[PDB]
């Protein structure tokens, strides 16, 4: 081939070029490194520029009568080797030296413009050097925001969109779909750092702000990658933005597939949204959705046939002879397969456009009209800079205009990954000219029910909650409502102090309010009914008192005892009247004057019944000799002697228990929510049993001595009533034991009340009532 000999053609105005034609596989001397390995992309782009220049020369409307030329070169993606040809371009015409002056306007450059490099790293280096001389430089691949500044790069233009537009579109998509809680990751190159720097401000200015901002280490021949993902998984975010080159994304996804990570919506850049490496990773289908933005642009349609024809021509021995009439000495031995890999690359057009732009500018500065145009002194490089701003130049029937910053405007398309088998496919669901336009019914998400994934925060906690601030830049809040055991004292100072001891407060309470003393009151529905029964209880007891003291001398009452019967009868009424001391507001006196003043009369009366029972036992069982002696003894003051003995025992027992464990008033708070309970407290059955000892013993001693006596033949017996009366006492006090321990606490004072009222009622219906009934009918009986 003779390709390498077609990199310099003459003309009235010559362009310069810088492409990565070759690659190179410790500096001790000042020598330029040598690159040998062949890269086809640089050759393809150089041939694209050659096509553009030939096409311009052929036409007649553009630069009619003038012939363009070019001078291509190699950069090796290394500043050291890319600086030398740059130093060459700005040199005295027809000379090999460069002159140092105080300013421009004293130079005679041997080129008119430069089609800059494909790399931002070299773009930054060469732009500063060029800007001193005001030599216009048009780049076809450099996409970095830092190059838009006009204070450091006055004479820089690019025909590829900057990285700001893609991030703005991503932010608008995030906002429209409603995603406030996100996580941002970027590579460890200048790429990722600049991307994060732009996106942080763009998001913070729209309501989105990030949960974590991290960098993914580059695969420079693994441990840190573990840490990065742990933080992401620890924030509960369903959306992740990845702004990284291809290698970092490949490493990250390989690691993620190796282990298990829950699927998430990944928002990509153009680096790895169309890379076969990532698409071909096994297991990639188990990570979730993949969206992105891809630019729209025409593609040259005659480039393949052009390169075929020119390669065939170079094969011609005759042409090489005429051609003679090395920047890249390694591209002379290549074949069609060495370049067929990328004859559809989407950047030849860019180079094409670049060249056209420069040409048009010249056409405008020379003031050329249709076919011929004025003769003047040659145009200087720094003159073109005035016509390049706001320049509408047509390429491939697509109008294009430069801006103040030197960028061009292009649209975008929203690409989504769809799986059909194991081969991903790219589908379009959106558009972005200046405002996003999205379609929502053509998306297939990764959730079970095909529903939009959700990632949101809260920016205002509702009144009644404590807010914990979360976020990298401290935007969002986590709202928590403390339970029903504390207040919300202040909006800040995140803590819910516990309520006061007297205070009650529910959940979500600004303050805890006071409570109410709780005790069975006198007007409670239960108390009235127990008091209504008291009226009947007193009523019937007195009537028996109205009878016994009336027929005192009758033979029937005489057998009962007469005066002895009354003393028991009156005593019963007193204990009945001792039923009112319990309810109401406790008082120290009524607490200590409740038990001992209630059971004392009972033992004062159960002696009366016992005297009768023992009387029946003397005759029914004992021998005659003892029967006569006891009959003449118990009939006398012995009856009152026993009563005094029982009274002395009861008081002594009560005094012992009184000192042993005197009941006291206690206040219970936590038993019920909104009422502090004050009530008199006892000690197990120790006090109960001690006070119950006497009447328990005397009642039993009555039962055994009169349960067995035979019924009188054809006449009322004096043993039946006592036997039936005593079993009434036993069941009442036996029956209420399970109750008093298995009822509501507040009603505990209200059950002790019943036991006496039910106890007394049975006695009046067992031993005294039968005498009253016969006495009422005594006049009619005889």
């Amino acid at each position: 081939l003779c390709l390498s000999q077609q990199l310099r053609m003459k003309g009235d105005y010559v362009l310069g070029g810088l492409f990565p034609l070759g690659e190179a596989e410790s500096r001790t001397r000042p020598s330029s490194p040598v690159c040998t390995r062949f890269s086809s992309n640089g050759l393809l782009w150089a041939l694209a520029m050659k096509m553009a220049v030939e096409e311009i020369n052929n036409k007649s409307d553009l630069l009619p009568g003038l012939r363009l030329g070019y001078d291509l070169f190699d950069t090796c993606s290394e500043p050291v080797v890319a600086m030398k040809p740059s130093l060459m371009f700005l040199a005295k015409a027809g000379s090999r030296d460069i002159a140092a002056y105080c300013n421009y306007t004293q130079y005679q450059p041997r080129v008119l413009a430069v089609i800059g490099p494909h790399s931002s790293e070299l773009a930054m280096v060469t732009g500063k050097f060029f800007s001193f001389f005001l030599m216009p430089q048009v780049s076809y691949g450099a996409s970095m925001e830092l190059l838009s500044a006009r204070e450091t790069f006055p004479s820089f233009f690019r025909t590829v969109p900057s990285d700001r537009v893609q991030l703005t579109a991503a932010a608008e998509l995030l906002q429209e779909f409603g995603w406030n809680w996100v996580a941002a990751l970027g590579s460890d190159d200048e790429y990722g750092r600049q991307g994060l720097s732009i996106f942080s401000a763009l998001a913070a200015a729209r309501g989105i702000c990030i949960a974590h901002e991290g960098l993914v280490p580059l695969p420079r021949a693994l441990g840190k990658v573990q840490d990065v993902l742990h933080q992401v998984n620890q924030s509960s975010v369903q959306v992740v933005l990845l702004f990284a080159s291809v290698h970092a994304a490949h490493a990250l996804f390989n690691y993620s597939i190796s282990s298990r990570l829950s699927p998430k919506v990944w928002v990509a850049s153009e680096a790895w949204l169309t890379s076969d490496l990532v698409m071909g990773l096994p297991g990639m289908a188990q990570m979730g959705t993949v969206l992105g933005f891809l630019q729209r642009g025409a593609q040259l349609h005659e480039f393949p046939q052009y390169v075929k024809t020119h390669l065939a021509l170079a094969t011609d021995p005759a042409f090489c002879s005429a051609l003679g009439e090395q920047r890249c000495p390694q591209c002379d031995c290549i074949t069609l397969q060495n370049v067929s890999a990328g004859l559809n690359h989407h950047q030849t057009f860019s180079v094409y456009a670049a060249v056209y732009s420069v040409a048009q500018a010249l056409h405008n500065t020379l003031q050329c009209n249709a076919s011929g145009c004025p003769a003047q002194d040659p145009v200087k490089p720094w003159q073109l800079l005035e016509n390049m701003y706001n320049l509408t130049f047509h390429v491939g029937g697509l109008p294009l205009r430069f801006d103040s910053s030197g960028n061009v405007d292009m649209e975008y398309d929203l690409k989504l990954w769809v799986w059909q088998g194991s081969v991903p496919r790219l589908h379009d669901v959106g558009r972005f000219n200046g405002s996003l336009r999205t379609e929502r019914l053509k998306i297939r998400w990764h959730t079970s029910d095909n529903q939009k994934p959700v990632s949101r925060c809260s920016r205002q906690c509702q009144e009644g909650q404590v807010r914990r601030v979360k976020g990298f830049h401290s935007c969002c809040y986590d709202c928590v409502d403390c339970e029903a055991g504390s207040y919300r004292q202040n909006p800040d100072d995140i803590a819910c102090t516990f309520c006061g001891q007297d205070e009650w407060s529910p959940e979500r309470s600004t303050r805890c309010f006071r409570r109410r003393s709780r005790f069975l009151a006198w007007g409670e529905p239960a108390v009235l009914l127990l008091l209504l029964l008291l009226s009947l209880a007193l009523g019937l007891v007195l009537a028996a008192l109205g009878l016994f003291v009336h027929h005192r001398d009758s033979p029937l009452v005489q057998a009962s005892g007469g005066p002895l019967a009354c003393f028991g009868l009156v005593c019963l009424g007193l204990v009945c009247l001792s039923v009112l001391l319990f309810p109401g507001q406790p008082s120290p006196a009524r607490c200590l004057a409740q038990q001992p003043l209630s059971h004392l009369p009972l033992t004062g009366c159960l002696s009366t019944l016992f005297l009768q029972a023992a009387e029946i036992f003397v005759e029914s069982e004992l021998p005659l000799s003892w029967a006569d002696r006891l009959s003449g003894c118990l009939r006398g003051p012995w009856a009152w002697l026993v009563v005094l003995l029982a009274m002395l025992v009861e008081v002594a027992l009560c005094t012992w228990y009184l000192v042993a464990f005197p009941p006291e008033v206690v206040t219970d708070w936590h038993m019920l929510p909104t009422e502090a309970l004050v009530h008199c407290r006892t000690r197990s059955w120790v006090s109960f049993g001690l006070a119950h000892a006497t009447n328990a013993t005397l009642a039993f001693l009555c039962f055994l001595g009169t349960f067995l006596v035979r019924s009188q033949p054809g006449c009322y017996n004096r043993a039946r009533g006592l036997t039936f009366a005593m079993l009434a006492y036993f069941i009442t006090w036996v029956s209420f034991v399970p109750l008093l321990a298995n009822v509501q606490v507040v009603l505990r004072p209200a059950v002790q009340m019943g036991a006496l009222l039910l106890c007394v009622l049975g006695i009046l219906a067992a031993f005294h009532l039968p005498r009253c009934y016969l006495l009422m009918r005594q006049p009619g009986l005889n």
Partner: protein, 770 residues
């Protein structure tokens, strides 16, 4: 002043004006640095042992910050007449100068290096710090005489460790400086157990300009975020000429209380220092480079308008960077002396290509003002740093040393005393969560590790700080613990003891009962002829008395440690006797009424039917049920002793035989109650109408004694009395048996030994018919 001819020349790039190059405000820093360079050159000329004969010159040029960077380099690289040949091998290019003392700003340094790399022309910088400048692949001919930024970050972190601070805020400017420094600080902090509350970007601005409302809103929001968090240590990475507006905004509010960790950029600046109202915001600590007094320099410097204005300030400060230029110049001089091979008093002139000087510069080693000047493989000289506190009173200097930093050791040292702003000169406190008390575990809250909550553990669990502090391990074995107890106090069990009074009370009640039966046993035996003994059915009565002695002989199995050997008897032996004891009384009641009632009411078959199948077999069937129900009970349950927890206090526990549960206790008190009631009904039927030998009376009596004990036990057990279940059951067990010992035979003992009214054979023969 900017020119001096000599055999060898040197370059210089300082920024005299920074705010054509002569159109901005003056900067005296450039002037005194240039004067330092000139003084170094003249001093090296004066001496007669460093370079004999060989003179030195200089060629200085302004740079005007990042405005002018290309022209000076082209100027330096030119043979003469401003012509620079272009070729492919510069091994024989004699450039105008021999070395360049590079510029101050990092970006200009990088720009100049990217040009000078082709010719390998040594360049020493003196004020640019950035880790990116340590890459010798990109920059093969760049050296530095000050440490990099990681050392600054290390000093900051060691300061934050010496005093306990683990909750800080970070503010950064919008440029490469702030972004890089903040990222580096975050990476460092992530590995040292320190937290960052949040981060923010200050809007980029300049003094003497008008700002928009949006930027004021941004500053207001930033200051509010500052005055809402609990962190009180703020680290600022930004350059001067931007912080005036921020500090004015913070002063407008009432934000007081913070430690402001500055950086090299504004750690020493007079214009911001002069703001008097700034005094009352907290302590101001900065990181700077140690100063080295240079003998015989003020005479050269003093001997222009701006220099006199701040001459007092240039006396107090300004001696922190001149040593860098001094050392760089002397390093170049020593490298040149070594390369030429000169001696104490002899020299030999020779062409010197710049690329040769680099090899000798890389290996210089000498002492200057008691400091060793040698270059590390990354192109650095290790000079000590300082931490400087800002002092306001004008008596002493405005920047006071508080500590020293040694790059070759990565350690803070010689920490002096600092005047804080707290009430009683205490160390300002900065922490997220308070330390936990004893025994409490950690409940995480949030994403930061250093924030947490204190949770108290419940009884039965202990917290081993030697192990996971986020969860307390459950106390295993018999050990027990309660709230806030890392150590347990293993518990205790009890059983019916000896000294306990209730046990003694049961002992006396049982003993007198046992003695009564034995006295009856001799009495019912030696009187085998009287009808009373024969009226009891015969030897059958004796079988009944004996089985009662065993029962009371089974009182002591209830006292002692509980185990299977004794738990078996308590379940099988004790209740076996009871059912038969009542049954013999029940079948006895069958004799009293039925034997003559049905023999007179159903004589058709009853007379002969019961003649052969006496009452003995009927009792046996009742027994046969007793074994069947018993064996079923043992199979349904187990013989393993049961353990329980005492509600009175955890330290006590209870062990007892399996039937201790009332449900199991009632297992055998069902047929026994049935046998009791049927016997009671029959006895009452023949209460007094028959007078066989006055046996119905007693049977009803002893039956009543049994019933009251049974009903009393159940009712009381419906309430429970702590550790009393064992004693109450024993008291009932001894009581119910006593109902038999002194309620069935005791009275019959009386008749035999007191009244012969029944012993006479004639009398009993009379009552038998009746």
């Amino acid at each position: 002043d900017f020119y001096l001819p000599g055999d060898y020349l040197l370059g210089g790039l300082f920024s005299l004006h920074a705010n054509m190059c002569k159109e901005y405000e003056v900067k005296v820093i450039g002037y005194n640095l240039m004067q330092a360079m000139r003084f170094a050159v003249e001093e090296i000329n004066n001496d007669s042992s460093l370079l004999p004969g060989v003179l030195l010159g200089y060629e200085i040029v302004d740079v005007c910050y990042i405005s002018n960077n290309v022209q000076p380099v082209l100027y330096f690289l030119a043979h003469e007449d401003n012509l620079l040949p272009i070729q492919e091998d510069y091994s024989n290019y004699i450039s105008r100068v021999v070395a360049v003392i590079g510029p101050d700003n990092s970006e200009s340094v990088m720009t100049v290096a990217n040009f000078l790399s082709l010719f390998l022309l040594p360049q020493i910088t003196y004020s640019a710090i950035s880790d990116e400048l340590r890459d010798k692949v990109r920059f093969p001919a760049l050296l530095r005489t000050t440490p990099s930024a990681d050392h600054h970050i290390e000093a900051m972190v060691q300061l934050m460790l010496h005093f306990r601070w683990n909750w800080i805020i970070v503010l950064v400017s919008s440029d490469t400086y702030g972004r890089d420094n903040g990222q580096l600080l975050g990476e460092r902090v992530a590995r040292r157990d320190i937290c960052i509350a949040f981060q923010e970007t200050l809007p980029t601005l300049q003094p003497n300009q008008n700002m928009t409302s949006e930027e004021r809103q941004r500053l207001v929001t930033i200051v509010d975020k500052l005055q809402q968090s609990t962190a009180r240590v703020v680290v600022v990475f930004s350059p001067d000429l931007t912080l005036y507006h921020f500090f004015n905004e913070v002063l407008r509010q009432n934000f007081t209380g913070a430690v402001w960790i500055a950086s090299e950029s504004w750690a020493i600046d007079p214009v911001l220092h002069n703001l008097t109202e700034l005094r009352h915001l907290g302590t101001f600590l900065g990181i700077t480079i140690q100063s080295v007094p240079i003998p015989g320099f003020s005479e050269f410097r003093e001997w222009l308008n701006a220099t006199l204005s701040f001459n007092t300030i240039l006396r107090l400060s300004g001696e922190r960077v001149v040593y860098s230029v001094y050392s760089a110049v002397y390093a170049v001089a020593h490298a040149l002396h070594s390369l030429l091979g000169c001696d104490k008093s002899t020299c030999t002139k020779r062409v010197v290509y710049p690329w040769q000087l680099l090899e000798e510069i890389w290996k210089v080693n000498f002492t200057l003002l008691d400091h060793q000047i040698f270059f590390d493989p990354q192109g650095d000289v290790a000079l000590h740093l300082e931490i400087v506190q800002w002092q306001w009173d004008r008596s002493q200097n405005p920047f006071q040393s508080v500590a020293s930093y040694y790059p070759l050791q990565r350690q803070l040292k010689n920490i002096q005393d600092i005047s804080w702003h707290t009430i009683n000169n205490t160390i300002p406190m900065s922490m997220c969560s308070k330390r936990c008390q004893s025994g409490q575990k950690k409940k995480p809250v949030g994403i930061h590790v250093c924030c947490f909550e204190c949770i108290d553990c419940l009884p039965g669990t202990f917290l081993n700080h030697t192990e996971d502090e986020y969860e307390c391990q459950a106390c295993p074995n018999n050990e027990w613990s309660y709230q806030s107890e890392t150590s347990c106090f293993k518990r205790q069990l009890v059983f019916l003891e000896w000294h306990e009074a209730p046990t003694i009370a049961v002992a006396l009640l049982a003993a007198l009962g046992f003695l009564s039966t034995l006295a009856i046993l001799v009495i019912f035996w030696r009187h085998f002829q009287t009808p009373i003994v024969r009226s009891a059915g015969g030897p059958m009565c004796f079988l009944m008395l004996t089985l009662l002695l065993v029962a009371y002989m089974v009182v002591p199995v209830y006292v002692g440690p509980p185990k299977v050997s004794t738990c078996l008897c308590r379940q099988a032996l004790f209740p076996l006797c009871f059912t038969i004891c009542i049954s013999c009384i029940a079948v006895r009641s069958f004799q009293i009424v039925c034997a003559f009632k049905m023999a007179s009411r159903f004589p058709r078959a009853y007379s002969y039917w019961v003649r052969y199948q006496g009452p003995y077999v009927s009792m046996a069937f009742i027994t046969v049920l007793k074994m069947v129900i018993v064996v079923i009970g043992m199979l349904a349950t187990g013989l393993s002793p049961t353990t329980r927890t005492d509600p009175d206090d955890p330290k006590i526990t209870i062990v007892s035989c399996n039937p201790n549960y009332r449900n199991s206790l009632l297992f055998n008190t069902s047929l026994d109650l049935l046998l009791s009631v049927v016997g009671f009904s029959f006895a009452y039927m023949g209460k007094e109408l028959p007078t066989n030998y006055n046996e119905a009376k007693f049977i009803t009596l002893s039956m009543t004694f049994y019933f009251t004990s049974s009903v009393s036990l159940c009712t009381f057990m419906s309430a429970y009395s702590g550790v009393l279940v064992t004693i109450v059951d024993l008291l009932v067990t001894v009581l119910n048996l006593l109902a038999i010992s002194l309620g069935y035979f005791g009275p019959k003992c009386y008749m035999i030994l007191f009244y012969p009214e029944r012993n006479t054979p004639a009398y009993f023969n009379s009552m038998i018919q009746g």
